Tab-separated table of N, CA, C and O in Angstrom:
chain	number	residue	atom	x	y	z
R	1	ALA	N	131.144	208.441	62.944
R	1	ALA	CA	131.273	209.601	63.864
R	1	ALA	C	131.634	209.145	65.273
R	1	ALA	O	131.191	208.084	65.723
R	2	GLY	N	132.447	209.959	65.960
R	2	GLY	CA	132.869	209.641	67.316
R	2	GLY	C	134.275	209.072	67.365
R	2	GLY	O	134.464	207.863	67.216
R	3	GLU	N	135.255	209.957	67.579
R	3	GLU	CA	136.664	209.554	67.654
R	3	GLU	C	137.319	210.105	68.917
R	3	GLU	O	136.960	211.186	69.391
R	4	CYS	N	138.283	209.344	69.452
R	4	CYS	CA	139.008	209.737	70.664
R	4	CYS	C	140.276	210.514	70.324
R	4	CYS	O	140.917	210.251	69.301
R	5	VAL	N	140.625	211.474	71.188
R	5	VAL	CA	141.814	212.306	70.998
R	5	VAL	C	142.835	212.019	72.107
R	5	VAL	O	142.611	212.354	73.273
R	6	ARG	N	143.959	211.380	71.720
R	6	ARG	CA	145.066	211.015	72.643
R	6	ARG	C	144.580	210.148	73.828
R	6	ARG	O	145.193	210.138	74.906
R	7	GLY	N	143.490	209.403	73.600
R	7	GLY	CA	142.923	208.537	74.630
R	7	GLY	C	141.871	209.230	75.491
R	7	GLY	O	141.602	208.783	76.610
R	8	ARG	N	141.283	210.313	74.964
R	8	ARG	CA	140.258	211.074	75.685
R	8	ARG	C	139.078	211.390	74.770
R	8	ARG	O	139.249	212.007	73.712
R	9	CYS	N	137.881	210.954	75.185
R	9	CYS	CA	136.654	211.181	74.419
R	9	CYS	C	135.502	211.613	75.347
R	9	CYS	O	135.093	210.836	76.216
R	10	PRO	N	134.966	212.865	75.190
R	10	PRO	CA	133.861	213.359	76.029
R	10	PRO	C	132.479	212.853	75.559
R	10	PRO	O	132.397	211.875	74.810
R	11	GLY	N	131.412	213.530	76.006
R	11	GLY	CA	130.055	213.153	75.637
R	11	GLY	C	129.394	212.231	76.654
R	11	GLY	O	128.174	212.267	76.825
R	12	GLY	N	130.216	211.414	77.328
R	12	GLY	CA	129.711	210.479	78.325
R	12	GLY	C	129.480	209.087	77.762
R	12	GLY	O	128.457	208.460	78.053
R	13	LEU	N	130.435	208.612	76.954
R	13	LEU	CA	130.352	207.287	76.334
R	13	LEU	C	131.680	206.522	76.496
R	13	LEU	O	132.563	206.967	77.237
R	14	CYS	N	131.816	205.378	75.803
R	14	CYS	CA	133.020	204.546	75.903
R	14	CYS	C	134.018	204.858	74.792
R	14	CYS	O	133.640	205.338	73.717
R	15	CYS	N	135.300	204.581	75.071
R	15	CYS	CA	136.380	204.819	74.116
R	15	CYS	C	137.245	203.569	73.951
R	15	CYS	O	137.733	203.011	74.940
R	16	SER	N	137.417	203.140	72.697
R	16	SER	CA	138.232	201.970	72.375
R	16	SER	C	139.672	202.378	72.077
R	16	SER	O	139.911	203.437	71.475
R	17	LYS	N	140.618	201.507	72.479
R	17	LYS	CA	142.072	201.729	72.310
R	17	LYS	C	142.490	202.033	70.865
R	17	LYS	O	143.558	202.604	70.636
R	18	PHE	N	141.642	201.654	69.895
R	18	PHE	CA	141.912	201.899	68.474
R	18	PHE	C	141.662	203.370	68.102
R	18	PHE	O	141.961	203.796	66.980
R	19	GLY	N	141.120	204.135	69.064
R	19	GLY	CA	140.833	205.545	68.856
R	19	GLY	C	139.409	205.789	68.400
R	19	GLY	O	139.184	206.525	67.434
R	20	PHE	N	138.445	205.166	69.095
R	20	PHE	CA	137.021	205.317	68.737
R	20	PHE	C	136.138	205.491	69.977
R	20	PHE	O	136.541	205.148	71.090
R	21	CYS	N	134.931	206.030	69.757
R	21	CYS	CA	133.959	206.257	70.827
R	21	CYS	C	132.642	205.547	70.516
R	21	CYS	O	132.306	205.346	69.345
R	22	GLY	N	131.901	205.175	71.569
R	22	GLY	CA	130.627	204.491	71.384
R	22	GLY	C	129.975	204.093	72.693
R	22	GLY	O	130.649	203.990	73.722
R	23	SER	N	128.658	203.867	72.646
R	23	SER	CA	127.890	203.477	73.823
R	23	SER	C	127.295	202.083	73.649
R	23	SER	O	126.890	201.706	72.544
R	24	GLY	N	127.248	201.324	74.749
R	24	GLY	CA	126.705	199.974	74.724
R	24	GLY	C	127.786	198.901	74.616
R	24	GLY	O	128.980	199.233	74.650
R	25	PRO	N	127.413	197.591	74.486
R	25	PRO	CA	128.383	196.486	74.375
R	25	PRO	C	129.003	196.383	72.969
R	25	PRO	O	128.835	195.384	72.258
R	26	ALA	N	129.727	197.442	72.587
R	26	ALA	CA	130.394	197.518	71.285
R	26	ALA	C	131.770	198.159	71.438
R	26	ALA	O	132.761	197.665	70.892
R	27	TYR	N	131.807	199.266	72.184
R	27	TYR	CA	133.044	199.995	72.460
R	27	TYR	C	133.323	200.009	73.967
R	27	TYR	O	134.354	200.526	74.414
R	28	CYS	N	132.393	199.423	74.739
R	28	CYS	CA	132.507	199.355	76.191
R	28	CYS	C	133.106	198.022	76.647
R	28	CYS	O	133.967	197.997	77.532
R	29	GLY	N	132.645	196.925	76.031
R	29	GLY	CA	133.139	195.598	76.377
R	29	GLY	C	132.047	194.700	76.927
R	29	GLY	O	131.546	193.822	76.218
R	30	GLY	N	131.686	194.927	78.194
R	30	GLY	CA	130.650	194.135	78.842
R	30	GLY	C	130.028	194.848	80.025
R	30	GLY	O	130.541	194.688	81.151
């Protein structure tokens, strides 16, 4: 669960260039 649309993802979390969303050092980087 958690996918980005055209490079935009709400909720207040991170979005990966592969088209995904997530919080913490997983989809954010560092």
